[PDB]
Design a protein around this nucleic acid. Sequence first.
DNA 1: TGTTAGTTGGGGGGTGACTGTTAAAAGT
DNA 2: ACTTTTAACAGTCACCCCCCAACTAACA
Length: 195
Amino acid sequence: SSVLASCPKKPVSSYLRFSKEQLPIFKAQNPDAKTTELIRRIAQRWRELPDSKKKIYQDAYRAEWQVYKEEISRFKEQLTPSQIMSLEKEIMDKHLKRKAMTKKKELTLLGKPKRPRSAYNVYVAERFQEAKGDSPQEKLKTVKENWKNLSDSEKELYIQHAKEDETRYHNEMKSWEEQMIEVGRKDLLRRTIKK
DNA sequence: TGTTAGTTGGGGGGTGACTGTTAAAAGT
DNA sequence: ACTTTTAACAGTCACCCCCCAACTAACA
């Protein structure tokens, strides 16, 4: 039920067409080399390739562009309003998710401290494994139920471990945010802390 | 004060970074 | 108009997200 998946995609431009055909060859002749390295060498092949040769690829791309113009129009015109709407949402959702992940992958490279664990988090970590259930979803529900029934005294270790992680997070954030200052990124810093 | 998103567990499907160039889009 | 960003190919590695609900820091 995804309009987007059935949507005609843009033809590949010249270099990539080349790359798409070259890679399996380089891989055959260099079976153990990392793809990373093969691509670099392939781009070098492309750079050295005489303009008259690239033109061949470009000509193909330009022709492919013409069939794409025709395909995309016919497709769009064939779409009902509700389908147009879901296609737009799908594109929208796809974009935001891509931007989110990109930001997440960054912070992770930058070594941003995980946020604090709650007493509940700590509880799940201690009790998940022995919890009955056919699936993680069911085994989490099991834990959730037993948690709601925990007394305040039964909760003491979980809360204590949570408190301990609060201290952990505080410290780690301190150090990180300072390191981010050195790299001149006070924009990654929190606008508001508490205690 | 009310909203958000990132945590806990596992597991399978998903996807950005990496190596590149091109040119269509979107931003300024 | 003029510049930056992104979507387009793919193999391999790392994570990332998502589902289930609860909880809560940081945001606004």
